[PDB]
Design a binder for this molecule. Structure first.
Ligand code: CL
Ligand code: CL
Ligand code: CL
Ligand code: CL
Ligand code: NA
Ligand code: RU
Length: 129
């Protein structure tokens, strides 16, 4: 599914991400924009052989199992394919664990490089939330 900006904001809110670990909804929307362009089916191979999956480009090296990432973990206890679903529940639940891991949203390099410190509230501007 390719979400609209306010559609995804609404879904993330409904799923408990608004201010999760102190990160306003705009931060989550901004991260999703630059990780996946709001596309739940987004996949990208990393140089290390791992693959990132979904709306929030969660990595197969720690967080989900894809059967092809040697020496990896599956800390979210899910198949990476669950992260490509139109239903964002699995991605949100796993992102909750990632952002709680110690470095907050810096775990998402594109959040750090493109969202951090910016006017992230722009991302939820005009949404009925
Ligand atoms: Cl915000
Ligand atoms: Cl699996
Ligand atoms: Cl959903
Ligand atoms: Cl933090
Ligand atoms: Na894995
Ligand atoms: Ru839902």
């Amino acid at each position: 599914k390719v979400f609209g900006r306010c559609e995804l904001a609404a879904a993330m809110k409904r799923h408990g991400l608004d201010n999760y670990r102190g990160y306003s909804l705009g931060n989550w929307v901004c991260a999703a924009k630059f990780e996946s362009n709001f596309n739940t089916q987004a996949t990208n191979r990393n140089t290390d052989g791992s693959t990132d999956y979904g709306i929030l480009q969660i990595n197969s090296r720690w967080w989900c199992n894809d059967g092809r990432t040697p020496g990896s973990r599956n800390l979210c206890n899910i198949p990476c394919s669950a992260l490509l679903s139109s239903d964002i529940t699995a991605s949100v639940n796993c992102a909750k664990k990632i952002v709680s891991d110690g470095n907050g949203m810096n775990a998402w390099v594109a959040w750090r490089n493109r969202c951090k410190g910016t006017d992230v509230q722009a991302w939820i501007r005009g949404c009925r939330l």
